[PDB]
RNA sequence: GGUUGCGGCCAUAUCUACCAGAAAGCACCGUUUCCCGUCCGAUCAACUGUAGUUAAGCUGGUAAGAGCCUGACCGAGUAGUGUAGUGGGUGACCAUACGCGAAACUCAGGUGCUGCAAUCU
RNA sequence: GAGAACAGAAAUCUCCAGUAGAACAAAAGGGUAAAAGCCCCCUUGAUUUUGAUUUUCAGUGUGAAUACAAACCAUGAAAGU
RNA sequence: AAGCUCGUAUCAGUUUUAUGAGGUAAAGCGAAUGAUUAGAGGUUCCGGGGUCGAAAUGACCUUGACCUAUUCUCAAACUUUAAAUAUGUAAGAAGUCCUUGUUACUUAAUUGAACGUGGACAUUUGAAUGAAGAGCUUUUAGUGGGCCAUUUUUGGUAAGC
RNA sequence: GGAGCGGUAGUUCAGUCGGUUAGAAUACCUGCCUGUCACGCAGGGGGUCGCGGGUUCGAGUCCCGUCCGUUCCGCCA
């Protein structure tokens, strides 16, 4: 709208631009530095970070360790791959996040070999307990929670993702207070509420609450569930047998794709336009002087 | 060429500048409270003046940010004191507007003589859905020129519902 | 009176340099320092903790000790008659690697290869860097490119 | 801030006598004193004109 | 008594008479002000690795 | 090749004013019982991918645009400067030999590249 | 910059622009933008034992500072600090 | 001055090749910071003094700040840019690689880590030139009022200041 | 040729160096008294705290410069 305030020649010339990953607004550098910087006496020994991000209708979770060329992934795990584990609808919720975390844990440590040892907890009773130390035998694999920008509050699915991670074998150090059902008024964890949360108990209770409150909103939501024959008291058991679907075979089988990269290139390049040349530009300028200036 | 590019009220800020601290301000705070349904906030004087009478950081005025269907209610009944007649100014060049009124009594409120009389400032602020862009934490952005709230467009939107009179020079 | 603080006469030394303000970029921190490696010391005003003294700006020396977020560097300061060997404790942000040393190491790497090649040839190398030898006897070519004769140019006002 | 400390002996001062005289007439008596080396006695009388 | 206050004159010419003798370093440098932890570890390492060569190689 | 998450370098990437975007992707967008947090479900929280878009965002293109960059026998061997002279000059300073060597200006050329993992007619 | 009763050069509010033209206890210079700035939350690391180091230097002191250890704490979800 | 330990060491008031740091001379200000000469065009409802009008978010002149594009000029305590001269460090045996031992440190991991036995690679052993030896300790004298010259330069009108 | 000091209603001065306030005396003004003026009685106003800039929630007092006036030194030859 405005060109009276005027981003002038002078102002532009002496403008410093941030970093691209900050100019998008996607990477907190102040945090990132503090996170990734290794204790220099360890040398090349890398620091691994459990990246967890939540888009609208996906969860991304990836262990990354850095290198000055660019930050290299150890392994990745997504929520939209949960279909072949047996969870389809309602897939970016707290329980789903937990599941994703679990998958990433069991995956990375599977591919690193140890898995057999350091199975962690496999009760999932919602108790605050970390990956222990096996006396006589290798240390457990360590990795730190990278949130990025997603704000920290008690109850967030960020923390579900951590819970899933830690329980599934990977050492992520953490305090309890930001898991759901932490009593703020006195240092008293309730594991049973947390327990309920882990298997989508909040969601199931919500479904129960739309029995006689309203049943058009109920139809608006949960449409897929109605289609697939899913209901309240089945829900807690859906995540339960699906956890063992991870703990037998978590091995990452990628999609069949169909077509190859060249085909995709062929598709894409049709729509996006190329640049130009100098000659073409000069011609256009000539046209513009004919039409506007010379006036036919 | 108008599917998502719709228009609506984002929020409405009801405000009362009270020339001193303490009693009057507290009474105003009660006033806004029961009108809106939300409990208000109390702003501080940014610097010393003396000619007004106020000084540095004195807790001077009060306001409340109202949103949703609930703001529309108050806009209606309040807009009826000016009687569906605004001005050619009042609408800013950013596609927002406002109208000041006096006597809070003539918009639902009962007098109740311990309270008193206080004039109000309505400043309504507009948007097109998509203005999550600026206010969000992650992946902040600037809103493009074609999707901005202009003055003229806002005036049109106002005319179209409410049967509202723009009027004046 | 006279003044000699820890940052005496350092207006333009620790200036942050034009349009490169702030946000300590992250290559810096992942550059891995081994004991007994040569390092240059460009101080960095955008970090205050673990700073060098003004004297050591631009000065170069060997790393001796490592720690959590810093490195012990030794330098030969000149004082009175002699060289005295110091022991600094610079934070990693003020340091970069010696490019020259890296270059040297690469040269050494090539040297071994050259020696190996020579061996499969049957000895005789000549591996040292000789300077610019006084360039050889050659023949030029006129053919088309004739001596384009010049002259001196006369004095002219144009002012 | 606090109303404690009647002390301060009342003034020896002849100027403190006009204060002694003008008290019954009243009107916000604002009277400075000085603590210099722990010695404190009334120095000047002053009164605001309003404050209501 | 306005005497000459300071100069650095004819100082370099003193300096170069004996002449900027360099530190004269040794292999096995002095581990003084090297990380305590590291020093401790190295100690034990040396104690061990001596034993290996001493007991075995005979 | 596009697109996402994570990046390295940090504007050849930023800004101004416009126009294009199929697939998926994000993206906006629906809702507040629970965890959660606000003067306010705007923000952040959670719940739905269901109710709707490509209008914005993001990407790409355009402009004898700003800016930025890159080079040029472009200015210009210009200033300026290390070395020497019982060199010139009343001096200020200047020329000479051995060397070293800029900035503005002018012209032309460019307007992100690229690594890790995933996914897309 | 554009707007909102009393409201005016200025009192409160709201949007737009805004590379820093502010604010950082105090001189001046640096440094700082999801910040070292402002608002909130919880706190004593302004703690204990003794070295090593840099500065001014005679390479003594004093002061000031830096990197560490060994404790015991702080806060944070954590990386850390 | 006394020597001592060795006997071509590792060094050199130096260049070369390489790579660092610097913020001065220059330059720059139609680039920030300030300092400043001139008009042009805009601007005001958001400054006054007039003429046209009972008044007007008035018809029009005079200035006054502002804004835009241009202009002449500048800076020890201004700067995008940026020399020359001086300056740091490397030019390998205390090296490089191959195998593998050490540990109370560190690693998810006999991964790293520093230190190693063993094996290779030497007469261009890894730029120039020079080395009336190289290194090393003792002790003690006098000294601690300076001055002139080239160029750089501060006060000062200037001075054999 | 330097050092220190002063700065306010129309006048003499406090206030002021302590920063979120300008007081006394006289003069001036009004009414009253009085044949009329003085004296008195009862009320009232009047000072951008010399000027300009800066620091400051706030400057009249805090810092710097002109500006106009008062002081101190001018010794040994």
mmCIF file of N, CA and C (backbone and C1' of nucleotides) in Angstrom, chain A residues 50 94 97-98 101 121 124-131 145 147 151-168 170-198 202, chain F residues 34-37 45-46, chain G residues 76-78:
data_model
loop_
_atom_site.group_PDB
_atom_site.id
_atom_site.type_symbol
_atom_site.label_atom_id
_atom_site.label_comp_id
_atom_site.label_asym_id
_atom_site.label_seq_id
_atom_site.Cartn_x
_atom_site.Cartn_y
_atom_site.Cartn_z
ATOM 1 N N UNK A 50 16.405 -35.541 19.389
ATOM 2 C CA UNK A 50 15.098 -35.996 18.966
ATOM 3 C C UNK A 50 14.309 -34.782 18.508
ATOM 4 N N UNK A 94 -2.509 -36.731 21.206
ATOM 5 C CA UNK A 94 -1.498 -36.988 22.234
ATOM 6 C C UNK A 94 -1.040 -38.449 22.184
ATOM 7 N N UNK A 97 0.948 -39.059 19.103
ATOM 8 C CA UNK A 97 2.291 -38.525 19.309
ATOM 9 C C UNK A 97 3.155 -39.505 20.091
ATOM 10 N N UNK A 98 2.565 -40.049 21.158
ATOM 11 C CA UNK A 98 3.228 -41.037 22.003
ATOM 12 C C UNK A 98 3.658 -42.238 21.177
ATOM 13 N N UNK A 101 6.550 -41.462 18.971
ATOM 14 C CA UNK A 101 7.744 -41.423 19.804
ATOM 15 C C UNK A 101 8.287 -42.826 20.036
ATOM 16 N N UNK A 121 10.608 -49.722 29.823
ATOM 17 C CA UNK A 121 9.302 -50.172 30.316
ATOM 18 C C UNK A 121 8.495 -50.680 29.126
ATOM 19 N N UNK A 124 3.735 -49.475 30.357
ATOM 20 C CA UNK A 124 3.065 -48.215 29.987
ATOM 21 C C UNK A 124 1.952 -47.907 31.006
ATOM 22 N N UNK A 125 2.330 -47.936 32.287
ATOM 23 C CA UNK A 125 1.430 -47.588 33.397
ATOM 24 C C UNK A 125 1.484 -46.091 33.754
ATOM 25 N N UNK A 126 2.226 -45.305 32.968
ATOM 26 C CA UNK A 126 2.263 -43.855 33.114
ATOM 27 C C UNK A 126 3.067 -43.373 34.303
ATOM 28 N N UNK A 127 4.061 -44.161 34.715
ATOM 29 C CA UNK A 127 4.925 -43.810 35.840
ATOM 30 C C UNK A 127 6.186 -43.117 35.318
ATOM 31 N N UNK A 128 6.656 -42.115 36.062
ATOM 32 C CA UNK A 128 7.867 -41.369 35.707
ATOM 33 C C UNK A 128 9.102 -42.219 35.998
ATOM 34 N N UNK A 129 9.589 -42.894 34.960
ATOM 35 C CA UNK A 129 10.817 -43.681 35.046
ATOM 36 C C UNK A 129 11.540 -43.692 33.704
ATOM 37 N N UNK A 130 12.862 -43.558 33.780
ATOM 38 C CA UNK A 130 13.717 -43.356 32.618
ATOM 39 C C UNK A 130 14.341 -44.682 32.197
ATOM 40 N N UNK A 131 15.109 -44.641 31.111
ATOM 41 C CA UNK A 131 15.899 -45.784 30.660
ATOM 42 C C UNK A 131 17.051 -46.028 31.635
ATOM 43 N N UNK A 145 15.637 -33.793 23.752
ATOM 44 C CA UNK A 145 14.382 -33.359 23.132
ATOM 45 C C UNK A 145 14.547 -31.993 22.461
ATOM 46 N N UNK A 147 12.473 -29.325 20.643
ATOM 47 C CA UNK A 147 11.119 -28.865 20.371
ATOM 48 C C UNK A 147 11.088 -27.948 19.151
ATOM 49 N N UNK A 151 5.651 -23.945 21.680
ATOM 50 C CA UNK A 151 5.778 -23.483 23.070
ATOM 51 C C UNK A 151 5.605 -24.625 24.083
ATOM 52 N N UNK A 152 6.394 -24.554 25.148
ATOM 53 C CA UNK A 152 6.346 -25.502 26.245
ATOM 54 C C UNK A 152 5.202 -25.156 27.195
ATOM 55 N N UNK A 153 4.248 -26.078 27.323
ATOM 56 C CA UNK A 153 3.275 -26.077 28.425
ATOM 57 C C UNK A 153 3.058 -27.505 28.898
ATOM 58 N N UNK A 154 2.750 -27.661 30.180
ATOM 59 C CA UNK A 154 2.358 -28.967 30.708
ATOM 60 C C UNK A 154 1.116 -29.482 29.966
ATOM 61 N N UNK A 155 1.176 -30.741 29.534
ATOM 62 C CA UNK A 155 0.070 -31.389 28.823
ATOM 63 C C UNK A 155 0.212 -31.495 27.315
ATOM 64 N N UNK A 156 1.196 -30.800 26.742
ATOM 65 C CA UNK A 156 1.369 -30.752 25.285
ATOM 66 C C UNK A 156 1.745 -32.107 24.699
ATOM 67 N N UNK A 157 1.322 -32.331 23.458
ATOM 68 C CA UNK A 157 1.694 -33.541 22.716
ATOM 69 C C UNK A 157 3.186 -33.667 22.379
ATOM 70 N N UNK A 158 3.902 -32.540 22.411
ATOM 71 C CA UNK A 158 5.368 -32.543 22.477
ATOM 72 C C UNK A 158 5.802 -33.563 23.530
ATOM 73 N N UNK A 159 5.329 -33.361 24.757
ATOM 74 C CA UNK A 159 5.729 -34.191 25.870
ATOM 75 C C UNK A 159 5.245 -35.616 25.754
ATOM 76 N N UNK A 160 4.092 -35.849 25.127
ATOM 77 C CA UNK A 160 3.669 -37.198 24.772
ATOM 78 C C UNK A 160 4.699 -37.903 23.904
ATOM 79 N N UNK A 161 5.197 -37.168 22.906
ATOM 80 C CA UNK A 161 6.218 -37.650 21.993
ATOM 81 C C UNK A 161 7.490 -38.047 22.721
ATOM 82 N N UNK A 162 7.879 -37.249 23.712
ATOM 83 C CA UNK A 162 8.999 -37.596 24.587
ATOM 84 C C UNK A 162 8.726 -38.881 25.377
ATOM 85 N N UNK A 163 7.575 -38.928 26.036
ATOM 86 C CA UNK A 163 7.164 -40.071 26.820
ATOM 87 C C UNK A 163 7.290 -41.367 26.012
ATOM 88 N N UNK A 164 6.737 -41.313 24.807
ATOM 89 C CA UNK A 164 6.822 -42.409 23.850
ATOM 90 C C UNK A 164 8.259 -42.766 23.551
ATOM 91 N N UNK A 165 9.083 -41.742 23.338
ATOM 92 C CA UNK A 165 10.504 -41.942 23.091
ATOM 93 C C UNK A 165 11.239 -42.657 24.232
ATOM 94 N N UNK A 166 11.083 -42.158 25.449
ATOM 95 C CA UNK A 166 11.882 -42.612 26.574
ATOM 96 C C UNK A 166 11.525 -44.052 26.938
ATOM 97 N N UNK A 167 10.224 -44.297 27.032
ATOM 98 C CA UNK A 167 9.695 -45.604 27.371
ATOM 99 C C UNK A 167 10.153 -46.662 26.368
ATOM 100 N N UNK A 168 10.267 -46.269 25.097
ATOM 101 C CA UNK A 168 10.715 -47.156 24.023
ATOM 102 C C UNK A 168 12.211 -47.405 23.865
ATOM 103 N N UNK A 170 15.161 -45.074 24.329
ATOM 104 C CA UNK A 170 16.116 -43.964 24.197
ATOM 105 C C UNK A 170 16.162 -43.108 25.454
ATOM 106 N N UNK A 171 17.368 -42.779 25.898
ATOM 107 C CA UNK A 171 17.548 -41.929 27.062
ATOM 108 C C UNK A 171 17.353 -40.477 26.655
ATOM 109 N N UNK A 172 16.206 -39.935 27.059
ATOM 110 C CA UNK A 172 15.951 -38.505 27.028
ATOM 111 C C UNK A 172 15.760 -38.089 28.486
ATOM 112 N N UNK A 173 16.659 -37.232 29.017
ATOM 113 C CA UNK A 173 16.478 -36.775 30.395
ATOM 114 C C UNK A 173 15.391 -35.716 30.437
ATOM 115 N N UNK A 174 14.630 -35.690 31.524
ATOM 116 C CA UNK A 174 13.497 -34.777 31.641
ATOM 117 C C UNK A 174 12.924 -34.780 33.047
ATOM 118 N N UNK A 175 12.259 -33.682 33.394
ATOM 119 C CA UNK A 175 11.475 -33.600 34.620
ATOM 120 C C UNK A 175 10.025 -33.961 34.297
ATOM 121 N N UNK A 176 9.344 -34.479 35.312
ATOM 122 C CA UNK A 176 7.978 -34.979 35.179
ATOM 123 C C UNK A 176 6.919 -33.893 34.942
ATOM 124 N N UNK A 177 7.103 -32.724 35.554
ATOM 125 C CA UNK A 177 6.030 -31.726 35.691
ATOM 126 C C UNK A 177 5.233 -31.361 34.432
ATOM 127 N N UNK A 178 5.824 -31.500 33.242
ATOM 128 C CA UNK A 178 5.117 -31.167 31.994
ATOM 129 C C UNK A 178 4.428 -32.339 31.268
ATOM 130 N N UNK A 179 4.316 -33.496 31.925
ATOM 131 C CA UNK A 179 3.352 -34.515 31.502
ATOM 132 C C UNK A 179 1.980 -34.147 32.064
ATOM 133 N N UNK A 180 0.896 -34.516 31.349
ATOM 134 C CA UNK A 180 -0.448 -34.174 31.823
ATOM 135 C C UNK A 180 -0.778 -34.803 33.171
ATOM 136 N N UNK A 181 -1.691 -34.169 33.898
ATOM 137 C CA UNK A 181 -2.069 -34.625 35.227
ATOM 138 C C UNK A 181 -0.980 -34.447 36.263
ATOM 139 N N UNK A 182 -0.140 -33.431 36.074
ATOM 140 C CA UNK A 182 0.792 -33.006 37.103
ATOM 141 C C UNK A 182 0.075 -31.956 37.946
ATOM 142 N N UNK A 183 0.032 -32.186 39.256
ATOM 143 C CA UNK A 183 -0.554 -31.241 40.205
ATOM 144 C C UNK A 183 0.410 -30.062 40.400
ATOM 145 N N UNK A 184 0.007 -28.874 39.945
ATOM 146 C CA UNK A 184 0.815 -27.652 40.108
ATOM 147 C C UNK A 184 0.854 -27.184 41.567
ATOM 148 N N UNK A 185 -0.274 -27.321 42.267
ATOM 149 C CA UNK A 185 -0.426 -26.804 43.636
ATOM 150 C C UNK A 185 0.424 -27.536 44.688
ATOM 151 N N UNK A 186 0.857 -28.756 44.382
ATOM 152 C CA UNK A 186 1.792 -29.490 45.236
ATOM 153 C C UNK A 186 2.463 -30.588 44.410
ATOM 154 N N UNK A 187 3.762 -30.808 44.626
ATOM 155 C CA UNK A 187 4.540 -31.754 43.798
ATOM 156 C C UNK A 187 4.055 -33.212 43.918
ATOM 157 N N UNK A 188 2.974 -33.507 43.194
ATOM 158 C CA UNK A 188 2.254 -34.779 43.286
ATOM 159 C C UNK A 188 1.778 -35.238 41.900
ATOM 160 N N UNK A 189 2.546 -36.134 41.274
ATOM 161 C CA UNK A 189 2.148 -36.756 39.999
ATOM 162 C C UNK A 189 1.003 -37.753 40.219
ATOM 163 N N UNK A 190 -0.010 -37.692 39.350
ATOM 164 C CA UNK A 190 -1.044 -38.728 39.268
ATOM 165 C C UNK A 190 -0.787 -39.529 37.994
ATOM 166 N N UNK A 191 -0.431 -40.819 38.134
ATOM 167 C CA UNK A 191 -0.091 -41.610 36.977
ATOM 168 C C UNK A 191 -1.312 -42.135 36.261
ATOM 169 N N UNK A 192 -2.451 -42.247 36.950
ATOM 170 C CA UNK A 192 -3.633 -42.872 36.381
ATOM 171 C C UNK A 192 -4.279 -41.990 35.326
ATOM 172 N N UNK A 193 -4.316 -40.684 35.575
ATOM 173 C CA UNK A 193 -4.775 -39.731 34.560
ATOM 174 C C UNK A 193 -3.840 -39.740 33.351
ATOM 175 N N UNK A 194 -2.538 -39.695 33.624
ATOM 176 C CA UNK A 194 -1.523 -39.809 32.587
ATOM 177 C C UNK A 194 -1.670 -41.091 31.777
ATOM 178 N N UNK A 195 -1.896 -42.189 32.490
ATOM 179 C CA UNK A 195 -2.178 -43.508 31.927
ATOM 180 C C UNK A 195 -3.331 -43.452 30.916
ATOM 181 N N UNK A 196 -4.416 -42.849 31.379
ATOM 182 C CA UNK A 196 -5.625 -42.672 30.584
ATOM 183 C C UNK A 196 -5.327 -41.890 29.313
ATOM 184 N N UNK A 197 -4.581 -40.805 29.494
ATOM 185 C CA UNK A 197 -4.130 -39.959 28.390
ATOM 186 C C UNK A 197 -3.378 -40.748 27.327
ATOM 187 N N UNK A 198 -2.450 -41.609 27.755
ATOM 188 C CA UNK A 198 -1.563 -42.270 26.803
ATOM 189 C C UNK A 198 -2.331 -43.074 25.753
ATOM 190 N N UNK A 202 -8.789 -39.355 27.216
ATOM 191 C CA UNK A 202 -9.428 -38.043 27.084
ATOM 192 C C UNK A 202 -10.382 -38.022 25.896
ATOM 193 P P C F 34 -13.681 -28.886 30.930
ATOM 194 O "O5'" C F 34 -12.584 -30.032 30.769
ATOM 195 C "C5'" C F 34 -12.669 -31.250 31.538
ATOM 196 C "C4'" C F 34 -11.665 -32.273 31.054
ATOM 197 C "C3'" C F 34 -10.203 -31.858 31.098
ATOM 198 O "O3'" C F 34 -9.690 -32.053 32.415
ATOM 199 C "C1'" C F 34 -10.681 -32.909 29.024
ATOM 200 P P C F 35 -8.987 -30.849 33.213
ATOM 201 O "O5'" C F 35 -7.523 -30.821 32.589
ATOM 202 C "C5'" C F 35 -6.638 -31.943 32.760
ATOM 203 C "C4'" C F 35 -5.333 -31.724 32.028
ATOM 204 C "C3'" C F 35 -4.710 -30.339 32.116
ATOM 205 O "O3'" C F 35 -4.069 -30.087 33.371
ATOM 206 C "C1'" C F 35 -4.574 -31.135 29.886
ATOM 207 P P C F 36 -4.104 -28.612 34.023
ATOM 208 O "O5'" C F 36 -3.705 -27.673 32.798
ATOM 209 C "C5'" C F 36 -2.352 -27.624 32.311
ATOM 210 C "C4'" C F 36 -2.223 -26.657 31.156
ATOM 211 C "C3'" C F 36 -2.609 -25.226 31.462
ATOM 212 O "O3'" C F 36 -1.588 -24.655 32.268
ATOM 213 C "C1'" C F 36 -3.490 -25.824 29.361
ATOM 214 P P G F 37 -1.953 -23.579 33.388
ATOM 215 O "O5'" G F 37 -1.980 -22.221 32.559
ATOM 216 C "C5'" G F 37 -0.888 -21.868 31.687
ATOM 217 C "C4'" G F 37 -1.364 -20.955 30.585
ATOM 218 C "C3'" G F 37 -2.034 -19.670 31.033
ATOM 219 O "O3'" G F 37 -1.024 -18.740 31.401
ATOM 220 C "C1'" G F 37 -3.266 -20.652 29.256
ATOM 221 P P A F 45 -0.211 -24.659 20.335
ATOM 222 O "O5'" A F 45 -0.858 -24.980 21.756
ATOM 223 C "C5'" A F 45 -0.065 -25.498 22.843
ATOM 224 C "C4'" A F 45 -0.957 -25.899 23.990
ATOM 225 C "C3'" A F 45 -2.015 -26.936 23.636
ATOM 226 O "O3'" A F 45 -1.462 -28.248 23.588
ATOM 227 C "C1'" A F 45 -3.061 -25.150 24.736
ATOM 228 P P A F 46 -1.309 -29.030 22.185
ATOM 229 O "O5'" A F 46 -2.530 -30.052 22.213
ATOM 230 C "C5'" A F 46 -2.763 -30.902 23.354
ATOM 231 C "C4'" A F 46 -4.227 -30.898 23.725
ATOM 232 C "C3'" A F 46 -5.158 -31.508 22.688
ATOM 233 O "O3'" A F 46 -5.147 -32.918 22.878
ATOM 234 C "C1'" A F 46 -6.029 -29.427 23.397
ATOM 235 P P G G 76 11.898 -23.472 37.267
ATOM 236 O "O5'" G G 76 12.290 -24.082 35.851
ATOM 237 C "C5'" G G 76 12.305 -23.229 34.701
ATOM 238 C "C4'" G G 76 13.085 -23.857 33.576
ATOM 239 C "C3'" G G 76 12.647 -25.239 33.144
ATOM 240 O "O3'" G G 76 11.344 -25.238 32.580
ATOM 241 C "C1'" G G 76 14.991 -25.116 33.091
ATOM 242 P P A G 77 10.314 -26.375 33.010
ATOM 243 O "O5'" A G 77 11.104 -27.698 32.613
ATOM 244 C "C5'" A G 77 10.718 -28.984 33.116
ATOM 245 C "C4'" A G 77 10.974 -30.036 32.066
ATOM 246 C "C3'" A G 77 12.434 -30.212 31.661
ATOM 247 O "O3'" A G 77 13.079 -31.172 32.493
ATOM 248 C "C1'" A G 77 11.068 -30.005 29.731
ATOM 249 P P A G 78 14.432 -30.790 33.257
ATOM 250 O "O5'" A G 78 15.460 -30.583 32.053
ATOM 251 C "C5'" A G 78 16.371 -31.627 31.627
ATOM 252 C "C4'" A G 78 16.423 -31.737 30.118
ATOM 253 C "C3'" A G 78 17.639 -31.123 29.429
ATOM 254 O "O3'" A G 78 18.732 -32.041 29.447
ATOM 255 C "C1'" A G 78 15.669 -30.455 28.306
#
